[PDB]
Amino acid sequence: NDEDQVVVNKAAVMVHQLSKKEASRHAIMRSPQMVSAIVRTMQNTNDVETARCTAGTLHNLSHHREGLLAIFKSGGIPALVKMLGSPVDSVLFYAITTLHNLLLHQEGAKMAVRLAGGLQKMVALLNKTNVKFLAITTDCLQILAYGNQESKLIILASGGPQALVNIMRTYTYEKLLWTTSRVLKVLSVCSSNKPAIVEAGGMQALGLHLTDPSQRLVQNCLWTLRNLSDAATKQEGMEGLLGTLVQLLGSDDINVVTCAAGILSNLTCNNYKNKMMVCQVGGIEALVRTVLRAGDREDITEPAICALRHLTSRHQEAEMAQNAVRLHYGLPVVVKLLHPPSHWPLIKATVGLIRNLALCPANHAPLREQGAIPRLVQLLVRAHQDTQREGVRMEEIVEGCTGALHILARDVHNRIVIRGLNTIPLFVQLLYSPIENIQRVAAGVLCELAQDKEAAEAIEAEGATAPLTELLHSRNEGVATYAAAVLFRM
């Protein structure tokens, strides 16, 4: 039969019972007339049992493909969103569930919800306390934000990051934690959201769940953590997270290992506090084992080497880390990574690690015995030639290899090897480099070599007096100091 009228609700309790039975439910969504009256009643009524009964109806309809369209074209979406402002409590449930079904299957619902101001309403509801309601709400936000930078910035403005992090800090309900982590993951790739997540303590919060039995939750937290750690700030209370990350390096899951290495790489970069802690929980040993176990998987070795590079310089236990790499059988494999099939990013990271390891006198001989010097020379020679003829710039390979050789040249037996490879003409040539940092390490390695009279003569014979004289007036104070140092020993 036809519609309700005015001042009567019994019709609301009417349409319900039928929406349950399929038979009438088909008739009801097959009727593009009263479905609009269902909507009209819901948004407008100030009665509780009528409002909840009305929302519950549309819910039952959202289960069927035509029931969606029925609600869709009837303009039910802006109504349901308005029902997300409804007070206690079951009306919020039917509303968010219906929207969810629409967002899942019904096409056009996404943009429609966005236009209705659904994003703002949903973010506001993240302070509720029902985990099932929060799981549905967070999933909607995920559906709306994925591959849609517009929605991501809205969620940010509405205070999404802080609310989502609080959920991760509060609840233990797996499905909610998982769903919330997927939203944070989507937001993590956003350049605007990422710092907000980090500022909300997102990294510590995600770190809480890295030992959860749910692998999909663990992996989501890892993926998000890598994006967030990607140039994050100086955070406190990272002790537990760092300890777990080192722990996760031994995981049998390669994707867990890849993420753990990457995050540790990012968190240790220019952060001596994080360097200390990672070292103090066995980071070197774990990272070395990881490199050995990884073989030629550069997805793993590259962030692992990078992490090792960070840990082996500029912090209180740097020297200890430099020894630790050797003590844990690391030197042979590190040198091996300078050879094919290693690609430039790994090679660059490896060279930088050798440079730090060479700071430790006890590493001079083993590095020499492994054949680091000729390989470093071959890299430098070929890299330089290529700079004379985007990814990794060869100017970085040139500077890196020359830098590593600069440190290795502190050892007497190394200087004989380096010199024996006819490198002096190359080094002198590098004094003409447009790049100051290259001039600096070129002058530096010459300064080390020129401590031996025979080398000092070969250096002078190479016509190095003139370039060094010009570099005396370099605005780079370091370049000038080395230039004067070589001149003196000549």
Short mmCIF file of N, CA, C and O in Angstrom, two decimals, residues 373 376-381 384 397-409 414-433 438-450 455 458-459 462-464 467-468 471 486:
data_model
loop_
_atom_site.label_atom_id
_atom_site.label_comp_id
_atom_site.label_asym_id
_atom_site.label_seq_id
_atom_site.Cartn_x
_atom_site.Cartn_y
_atom_site.Cartn_z
N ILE A 373 90.61 -2.13 -2.01
CA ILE A 373 91.31 -1.03 -2.67
C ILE A 373 91.27 -1.04 -4.21
O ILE A 373 90.92 -0.02 -4.81
N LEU A 376 87.66 -0.42 -5.28
CA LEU A 376 87.36 0.99 -5.05
C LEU A 376 88.00 1.87 -6.11
O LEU A 376 87.41 2.84 -6.57
N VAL A 377 89.23 1.52 -6.50
CA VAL A 377 89.93 2.26 -7.54
C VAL A 377 89.25 2.10 -8.90
O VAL A 377 89.06 3.08 -9.63
N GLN A 378 88.86 0.87 -9.23
CA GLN A 378 88.16 0.61 -10.49
C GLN A 378 86.85 1.39 -10.57
O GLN A 378 86.51 1.93 -11.63
N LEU A 379 86.13 1.45 -9.46
CA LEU A 379 84.89 2.21 -9.39
C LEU A 379 85.14 3.69 -9.62
O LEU A 379 84.44 4.33 -10.41
N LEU A 380 86.14 4.24 -8.93
CA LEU A 380 86.48 5.65 -9.04
C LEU A 380 86.92 6.04 -10.45
O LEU A 380 86.45 7.03 -11.00
N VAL A 381 87.82 5.24 -11.02
CA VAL A 381 88.32 5.48 -12.37
C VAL A 381 87.18 5.53 -13.38
O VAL A 381 87.07 6.47 -14.16
N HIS A 384 84.74 8.48 -12.71
CA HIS A 384 85.32 9.75 -13.14
C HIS A 384 85.22 9.92 -14.65
O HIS A 384 84.80 10.98 -15.13
N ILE A 397 79.84 8.72 -6.63
CA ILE A 397 80.70 7.54 -6.62
C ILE A 397 82.16 7.97 -6.58
O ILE A 397 82.97 7.39 -5.85
N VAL A 398 82.49 9.00 -7.36
CA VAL A 398 83.83 9.57 -7.37
C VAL A 398 84.22 10.06 -5.98
O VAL A 398 85.27 9.69 -5.46
N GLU A 399 83.35 10.87 -5.38
CA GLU A 399 83.61 11.43 -4.06
C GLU A 399 83.67 10.35 -3.00
O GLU A 399 84.51 10.40 -2.10
N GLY A 400 82.78 9.37 -3.10
CA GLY A 400 82.70 8.29 -2.13
C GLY A 400 83.94 7.42 -2.14
O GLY A 400 84.52 7.15 -1.08
N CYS A 401 84.35 6.97 -3.32
CA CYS A 401 85.52 6.11 -3.45
C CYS A 401 86.79 6.84 -3.02
O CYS A 401 87.63 6.27 -2.33
N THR A 402 86.92 8.09 -3.44
CA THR A 402 88.07 8.90 -3.06
C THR A 402 88.08 9.12 -1.55
O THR A 402 89.14 9.15 -0.92
N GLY A 403 86.89 9.26 -0.98
CA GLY A 403 86.75 9.44 0.46
C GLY A 403 87.16 8.20 1.23
O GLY A 403 87.83 8.30 2.25
N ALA A 404 86.74 7.04 0.74
CA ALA A 404 87.09 5.78 1.37
C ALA A 404 88.59 5.53 1.28
O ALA A 404 89.23 5.10 2.24
N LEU A 405 89.16 5.82 0.11
CA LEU A 405 90.59 5.66 -0.11
C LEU A 405 91.39 6.63 0.76
O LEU A 405 92.50 6.33 1.18
N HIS A 406 90.80 7.80 1.01
CA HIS A 406 91.40 8.80 1.88
C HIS A 406 91.64 8.25 3.29
O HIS A 406 92.69 8.48 3.88
N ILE A 407 90.65 7.52 3.81
CA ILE A 407 90.75 6.96 5.15
C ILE A 407 91.67 5.74 5.17
O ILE A 407 92.49 5.58 6.07
N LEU A 408 91.52 4.88 4.16
CA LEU A 408 92.37 3.69 4.04
C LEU A 408 93.84 4.06 3.89
O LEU A 408 94.72 3.29 4.26
N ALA A 409 94.10 5.26 3.36
CA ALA A 409 95.47 5.72 3.14
C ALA A 409 96.18 6.14 4.43
O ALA A 409 97.30 6.64 4.39
N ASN A 414 98.53 0.07 2.84
CA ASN A 414 97.48 0.51 1.92
C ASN A 414 97.99 1.55 0.93
O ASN A 414 97.65 1.50 -0.25
N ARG A 415 98.80 2.48 1.43
CA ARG A 415 99.37 3.53 0.58
C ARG A 415 100.23 2.95 -0.54
O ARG A 415 100.29 3.51 -1.63
N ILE A 416 100.90 1.84 -0.26
CA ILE A 416 101.71 1.17 -1.26
C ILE A 416 100.82 0.53 -2.33
O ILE A 416 101.12 0.59 -3.52
N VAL A 417 99.71 -0.06 -1.89
CA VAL A 417 98.75 -0.66 -2.80
C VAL A 417 98.08 0.40 -3.67
O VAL A 417 98.02 0.26 -4.89
N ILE A 418 97.60 1.46 -3.02
CA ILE A 418 96.94 2.56 -3.72
C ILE A 418 97.86 3.18 -4.77
O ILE A 418 97.48 3.37 -5.92
N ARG A 419 99.09 3.50 -4.35
CA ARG A 419 100.09 4.07 -5.24
C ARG A 419 100.44 3.11 -6.38
O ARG A 419 100.59 3.52 -7.53
N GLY A 420 100.55 1.82 -6.05
CA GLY A 420 100.90 0.81 -7.03
C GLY A 420 99.87 0.62 -8.13
O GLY A 420 100.15 0.00 -9.15
N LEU A 421 98.67 1.16 -7.92
CA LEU A 421 97.61 1.08 -8.91
C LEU A 421 97.59 2.32 -9.80
O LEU A 421 96.64 2.55 -10.55
N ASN A 422 98.66 3.11 -9.72
CA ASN A 422 98.79 4.36 -10.47
C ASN A 422 97.58 5.27 -10.32
O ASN A 422 96.86 5.53 -11.29
N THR A 423 97.36 5.75 -9.10
CA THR A 423 96.17 6.53 -8.79
C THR A 423 96.47 8.02 -8.67
O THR A 423 95.57 8.86 -8.82
N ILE A 424 97.72 8.34 -8.38
CA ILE A 424 98.17 9.73 -8.24
C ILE A 424 97.79 10.66 -9.41
O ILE A 424 97.35 11.79 -9.17
N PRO A 425 97.96 10.21 -10.67
CA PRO A 425 97.53 11.09 -11.76
C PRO A 425 96.04 11.40 -11.71
O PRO A 425 95.62 12.50 -12.06
N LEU A 426 95.24 10.43 -11.27
CA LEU A 426 93.81 10.61 -11.14
C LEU A 426 93.48 11.60 -10.02
O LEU A 426 92.69 12.51 -10.20
N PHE A 427 94.12 11.40 -8.87
CA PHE A 427 93.90 12.25 -7.71
C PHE A 427 94.21 13.72 -8.01
O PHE A 427 93.45 14.61 -7.65
N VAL A 428 95.34 13.95 -8.68
CA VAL A 428 95.74 15.30 -9.06
C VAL A 428 94.73 15.92 -10.02
O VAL A 428 94.40 17.10 -9.91
N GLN A 429 94.23 15.11 -10.94
CA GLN A 429 93.19 15.54 -11.88
C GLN A 429 91.92 15.97 -11.14
O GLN A 429 91.25 16.91 -11.55
N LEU A 430 91.62 15.28 -10.05
CA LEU A 430 90.42 15.56 -9.27
C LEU A 430 90.50 16.89 -8.52
O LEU A 430 89.50 17.37 -7.99
N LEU A 431 91.69 17.48 -8.47
CA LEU A 431 91.87 18.79 -7.84
C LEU A 431 91.18 19.87 -8.68
O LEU A 431 90.89 20.96 -8.19
N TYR A 432 90.92 19.55 -9.95
CA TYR A 432 90.29 20.47 -10.87
C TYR A 432 88.77 20.32 -10.87
O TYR A 432 88.08 21.00 -11.63
N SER A 433 88.27 19.42 -10.03
CA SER A 433 86.84 19.15 -9.96
C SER A 433 86.05 20.40 -9.58
O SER A 433 86.48 21.18 -8.73
N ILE A 438 84.72 16.92 -3.63
CA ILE A 438 85.62 16.07 -4.39
C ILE A 438 87.05 16.61 -4.30
O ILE A 438 88.00 15.85 -4.13
N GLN A 439 87.19 17.93 -4.40
CA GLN A 439 88.48 18.58 -4.24
C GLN A 439 89.05 18.26 -2.86
O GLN A 439 90.25 18.02 -2.71
N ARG A 440 88.18 18.25 -1.86
CA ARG A 440 88.58 18.05 -0.47
C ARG A 440 89.17 16.67 -0.22
O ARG A 440 90.22 16.54 0.40
N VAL A 441 88.48 15.63 -0.68
CA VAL A 441 88.94 14.26 -0.48
C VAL A 441 90.09 13.90 -1.41
O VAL A 441 90.91 13.04 -1.10
N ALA A 442 90.16 14.57 -2.56
CA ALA A 442 91.28 14.38 -3.48
C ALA A 442 92.54 14.94 -2.85
O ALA A 442 93.60 14.32 -2.89
N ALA A 443 92.43 16.13 -2.27
CA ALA A 443 93.56 16.76 -1.60
C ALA A 443 93.90 15.99 -0.32
O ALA A 443 95.06 15.92 0.08
N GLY A 444 92.88 15.40 0.29
CA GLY A 444 93.07 14.63 1.51
C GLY A 444 93.85 13.35 1.30
O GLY A 444 94.76 13.04 2.07
N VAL A 445 93.50 12.60 0.26
CA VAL A 445 94.18 11.35 -0.03
C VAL A 445 95.62 11.60 -0.48
O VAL A 445 96.52 10.82 -0.19
N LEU A 446 95.83 12.72 -1.18
CA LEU A 446 97.18 13.12 -1.58
C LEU A 446 98.01 13.47 -0.36
O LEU A 446 99.18 13.12 -0.27
N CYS A 447 97.39 14.17 0.59
CA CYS A 447 98.05 14.54 1.83
C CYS A 447 98.53 13.32 2.59
O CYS A 447 99.61 13.33 3.19
N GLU A 448 97.73 12.25 2.57
CA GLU A 448 98.11 11.00 3.21
C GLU A 448 99.25 10.33 2.47
O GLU A 448 100.20 9.83 3.08
N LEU A 449 99.16 10.31 1.14
CA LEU A 449 100.18 9.68 0.31
C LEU A 449 101.50 10.44 0.38
O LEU A 449 102.57 9.84 0.41
N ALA A 450 101.42 11.77 0.42
CA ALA A 450 102.60 12.62 0.39
C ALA A 450 103.44 12.56 1.66
O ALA A 450 104.47 13.23 1.76
N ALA A 455 106.32 9.06 -2.80
CA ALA A 455 105.00 9.44 -3.30
C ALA A 455 104.92 10.95 -3.49
O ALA A 455 104.34 11.43 -4.47
N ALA A 458 106.42 11.83 -6.76
CA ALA A 458 105.54 11.44 -7.86
C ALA A 458 104.36 12.40 -7.96
O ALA A 458 103.89 12.72 -9.05
N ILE A 459 103.88 12.86 -6.81
CA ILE A 459 102.80 13.83 -6.76
C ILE A 459 103.25 15.16 -7.37
O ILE A 459 102.54 15.74 -8.19
N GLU A 462 103.71 15.04 -10.99
CA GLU A 462 102.42 14.98 -11.66
C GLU A 462 101.87 16.39 -11.93
O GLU A 462 100.81 16.55 -12.53
N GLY A 463 102.61 17.40 -11.49
CA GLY A 463 102.20 18.78 -11.69
C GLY A 463 101.04 19.16 -10.78
O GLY A 463 100.08 19.79 -11.22
N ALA A 464 101.15 18.79 -9.51
CA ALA A 464 100.09 19.04 -8.55
C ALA A 464 100.28 20.36 -7.80
O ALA A 464 99.38 20.82 -7.11
N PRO A 467 97.54 23.24 -9.07
CA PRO A 467 96.16 23.14 -8.59
C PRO A 467 96.04 23.41 -7.09
O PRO A 467 95.14 24.13 -6.66
N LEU A 468 96.95 22.83 -6.31
CA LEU A 468 96.95 22.99 -4.86
C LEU A 468 97.10 24.45 -4.46
O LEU A 468 96.55 24.88 -3.44
N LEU A 471 93.81 26.14 -4.84
CA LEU A 471 92.90 25.66 -3.80
C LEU A 471 93.23 26.23 -2.43
O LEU A 471 92.50 26.02 -1.47
N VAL A 486 99.54 19.24 1.57
CA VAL A 486 100.25 18.51 0.53
C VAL A 486 101.45 19.32 0.04
O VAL A 486 102.54 18.78 -0.14
#
